[PDB]
Ligand binder design. Sequence first.
Ligand SMILES: Nc1ncnc2c1ncn2[C@@H]1O[C@H](COP(=O)(O)OP(=O)(O)OP(=O)(O)O)[C@@H](O)[C@H]1O
Ligand SMILES: [Mg+2]
Lengths: 485, 469, 469
Amino acid sequence: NLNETGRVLAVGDGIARVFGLNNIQAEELVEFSSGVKGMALNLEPGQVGIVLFGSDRLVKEGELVKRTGNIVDVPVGPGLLGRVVDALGNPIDGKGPIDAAGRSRAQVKAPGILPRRSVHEPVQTGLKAVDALVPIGRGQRELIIGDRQTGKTAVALDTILNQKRWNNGSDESKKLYCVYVAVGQKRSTVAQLVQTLEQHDAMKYSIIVAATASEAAPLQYLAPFTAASIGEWFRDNGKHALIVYDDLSKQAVAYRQLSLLLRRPPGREAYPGDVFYLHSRLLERAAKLSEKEGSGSLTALPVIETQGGDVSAYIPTNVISITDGQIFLEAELFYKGIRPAINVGLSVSRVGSAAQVKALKQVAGSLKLFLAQYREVAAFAQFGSDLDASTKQTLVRGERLTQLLKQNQYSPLATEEQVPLIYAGVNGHLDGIELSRIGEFESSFLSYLKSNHNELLTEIREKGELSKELLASLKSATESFVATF
Amino acid sequence: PITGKVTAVIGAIVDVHFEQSELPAILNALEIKTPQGKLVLEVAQHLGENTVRTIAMDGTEGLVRGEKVLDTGGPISVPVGRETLGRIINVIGEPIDERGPIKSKLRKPIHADPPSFAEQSTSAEILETGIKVVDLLAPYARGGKIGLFGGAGVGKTVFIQELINNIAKAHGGFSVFTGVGERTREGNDLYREMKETGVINLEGESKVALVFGQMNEPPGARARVALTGLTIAEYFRDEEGQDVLLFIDNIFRFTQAGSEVSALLGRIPSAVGYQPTLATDMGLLQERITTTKKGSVTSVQAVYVPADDLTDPAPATTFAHLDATTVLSRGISELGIYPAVDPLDSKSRLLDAAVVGQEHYDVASKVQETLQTYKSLQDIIAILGMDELSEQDKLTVERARKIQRFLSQPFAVAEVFTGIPGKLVRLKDTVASFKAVLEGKYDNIPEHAFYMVGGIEDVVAKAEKLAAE
Amino acid sequence: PITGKVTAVIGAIVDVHFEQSELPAILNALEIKTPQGKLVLEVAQHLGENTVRTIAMDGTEGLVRGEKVLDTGGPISVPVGRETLGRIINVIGEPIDERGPIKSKLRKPIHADPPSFAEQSTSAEILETGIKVVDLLAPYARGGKIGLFGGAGVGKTVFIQELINNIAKAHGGFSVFTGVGERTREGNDLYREMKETGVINLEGESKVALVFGQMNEPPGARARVALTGLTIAEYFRDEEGQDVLLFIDNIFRFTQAGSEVSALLGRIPSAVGYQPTLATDMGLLQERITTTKKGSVTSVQAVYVPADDLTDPAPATTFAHLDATTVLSRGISELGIYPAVDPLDSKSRLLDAAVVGQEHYDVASKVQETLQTYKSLQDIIAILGMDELSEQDKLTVERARKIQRFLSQPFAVAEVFTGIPGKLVRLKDTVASFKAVLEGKYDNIPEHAFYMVGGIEDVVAKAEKLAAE
Ligand SMILES: Nc1ncnc2c1ncn2[C@@H]1O[C@H](COP(=O)(O)OP(=O)(O)OP(=O)(O)O)[C@@H](O)[C@H]1O
Ligand SMILES: [Mg+2]
């Protein structure tokens, strides 16, 4: 019966070598005596390499190992909304069982050229520095990259939390469901994240998938694919999803552990040769599908942690090459009160204006031009007095705008609240306001606009475009404020 | 027929055994009749015990120890002909556009030897491109390798589109596009824009063939797609008797996939992690891109520079082969001039008096001198102002700004989004038009008259029409 | 009993062959009754052919091929409970104090699975440490996890001793100190002080449990003692329900001891030379150090940074497991500013206005802004000087030099080698002082008044004293 049932030859470090199993499929699951599960990654002329999803203490030499006939799959459906699930869809929140519309394989093939449609609709983060300078679209892949403790999870979570204004809506075309994949994180961090999402009522549209540090390395390697397969249900059923990976560097570390203990030869930085193929067939499963295939979308926000700010490292070098853009977070900006600490010069989007709200585009163009001028002159920032008139003016406006882009944590903004502010900044009104009062400005101005000029916000929201009849009234309404301020 | 059985499956690598004692040759293609489509494997090593080691052209998941494998009798054979135009072809020669089979008469191996020394062209030759900045400062070579350095955000896709339009339509010829690890979204966008521009037609004649190897595909495919398109380009050369141009996007991923396949095959990694065969693999790809008596396969290659390090072995090895460079830099769109080609970092081997003529070399040299003088004074212009400059350097900066702007050009394909009509300029009308600016004849005119104007004969008119407003 | 024979000895690794099929499980404990005293081995892996490979918790000197080994029937079992209070325990649970046996009802395995997600509990309370830089810029959480990151010679042992003096007596609950590759002298210096101050009453009630592996012990012991301390702490957390604080010094030694043994276990080494299992071998220990619905554990961990390289895999992986992290840096020590905390690299989850208050949050933000402005101007000051700087920036530099110096604070345990008597500063006083400094009240007092003093009143007192000189 060796075709169905093999014997363990050797076991250790989470890797078992099984004799027999002549018919086993690559990446198929095996069930050991004592019930521990494993994934058959290596098929060799006379033995099979199983990576154990659990503690190796249970497996002993001589163990009978029986094949399942099942490539690893996870449950999918809407009943997962509001739940915390492990890398295989098992509930770990204790609220009870999952109800699933079906099951989907982990490593399904991404959609091809033909069924896609171009990214043309926005993933509204509510962060000024993103929506106005590095827009994210539905169907995009944006890498949140930065050193430790720089603001990445904050960006992803503000993006999650800002969807509350649409997801309570009835128009299913605007609401965006969320999936958060915690790879390598400790369980207490997920506890705090679920607390934040519960406080804000965001759990009802969020699925959390948790391959925590204590989880076996195979499950940390596998969790992103299963979370992707969970989001792909919303994609394939005409719904919209945002999958955040926090973070893919640790999936790479787990894949390295697996590979090295399987005695595969290492490449650069001790990583395996095919880590690019690991992340690539993960990320570009994100797609924007055409009406023929249900108009659905899946948006990916992979996090990467850069040691010493070095983007020359192997996994950053790979993932920067797979993604459509990058939000670069830097600590020198954090400690200067620029929070979120987005380096507008290193950050880029390859989808660009197409993904942007039209009203915000109409001003982000000039915003970007002026901040580029500032990035050029900034070396001379401190000795502002002795410079030329034009350089002094550029320094002034750029510093006021950089201060303008900051905003508090867990306080996302609507685009109706972003447009007036970026307008007042671009069109020079803020030049007379001391750099310290800009925080008092954006708070006291919106409160004014909401009170005395509500129709401007209502039309910016409803119509989506700044009409001239409206842009002139916005100029009027900004002059009617800077005067009192 | 030669039938074998699988013995190992480790990632993208598969080992096959041929008990009948007739082993397949290296670079031959073997087939496994999987439930979904078929799985193609390229032989990479003979290892003894009648065992051969192969690189998979598709996912190896689902394979079983003991599965049959059938030898095809040769290397991966792509379809070739005019029936390839408008179609999208994968690495193994199969249509992925869902628009039916390819009824071609012939199929050609993706592995073929470069032309002999006796067959090569004896002299360089200039590719009139219709873009001022290209054919003034960094002109392209017929049958050469041109390297494009820049992301999508800076106009890369529309630059490729305008090249396909100007060379293939105004001058005449076909074109081949090869996505080696291209992002699938960009490929859908390119297909859609090419349908919008009339290079692809479904119910009629079309004049570009598409080979797409997506980034999701295993390293063995990305390592071979470039040859898949290069073979079609070579067929249109040697069997259609016409000059063609081959786009490879992006050439970095050819070397990346080579490094993956080498590491998987157990070859000792070299420097920062590339294959020892890096230079020879690049050579065996590039040196098919050359001029022969029957025609020239020209190439425009996008080159991804990781971490902006031109000293990384991948771009360093690519540079040895290409002789024209075109840097699309964000630092030029930040100040709002398109095509956004850096007039100074962009350079060409063919900018020689023996090729372009002395009249052109003088103009180009004085342009690269004025722009560089301006790029020298910027600190001075900032900390001080433009009043401190001498009257000489004030004129130099004026003419440098006018030249910086005049290098801008509205594309015949931007007519939809920018609205601007789009125009192309000959090399004479450009060389003389810049000679007239350097000679100071049109120093009377403001800078704005130069901004989106294809030639000075229209800068005069724009000046008049602006002054009349 | 199940018995076998030794077949290999390579450093701390020992291989054992069992003549019959009943092999011992992994992580089990095997005993060798060598006449120099018993030796305990932990089964690391099954090599096959009835052989197991094990790690030695004591010196392998004297082992002979052929020596008998006997299975104990389970993992290393350590005594747990109240009778562990006031006593010093080895990795294998035996006492190293001479007070005889630990009489206990329960012995418990050192290997146990972390708490589920349902058992987690998230606290938000602030632990007033008495240290200005911590209480201001990186407040420690009660029930949380604290790391003191620091290279050699930066002073984190004095920091640990200060945290013991300040927290351990006001905690009221139970305490566990786990030495992992630390100095034996600084274990004796802790035993003695705990015995003088009464927390270890040899002949009465005690409230601290000591577990001591030290840098003299083999790697197998350094890699496993932390689990013994964790077992005692976890029993106090779950079985007694008391409040617990767990000190681990130094937890880097666990990963280093794993690295030392990985090469002899037969594993391909990872990055700069560590074992593959670093990230998960670390997690299995680290995730047990956590608060649960059943009880609270407050964890202070010292994390060695080799070669001052914070990017070394071990610290880089540890940073993700801690709620608060204070990075001691050498530069701040050369400047004389003990306790040498980098005011910027130090961070805490609780530095949010919802917890510390808006006044405190804004004070910390202004301190960080001033210090980062100071650090951005360092090149200018080195080359050009302070004259070039603007009027606001000269003030910001003077104020930064005052602030960075006011974050210094003398410690009552450091007096023996610093001479300056100790100071404890309350949180409210610290916030008020740094607020008064930021608001400019003390621009008239020199920098030296802030060095190695406590609160602002001491700055004034020292200013008066210096003036009287
Ligand atoms: N916009 C903001 N304003 C103020 N504080 C912020 C902002 N964004 C983040 N922070 C702070 O930065 C800290 C880090 O948050 P975050 O979890 O995003 O970091 P991270 O990138 O996940 O780093 P790591 O995951 O490695 O801990 C938090 O304590 C948070 O209070
Ligand atoms: Mg994070």
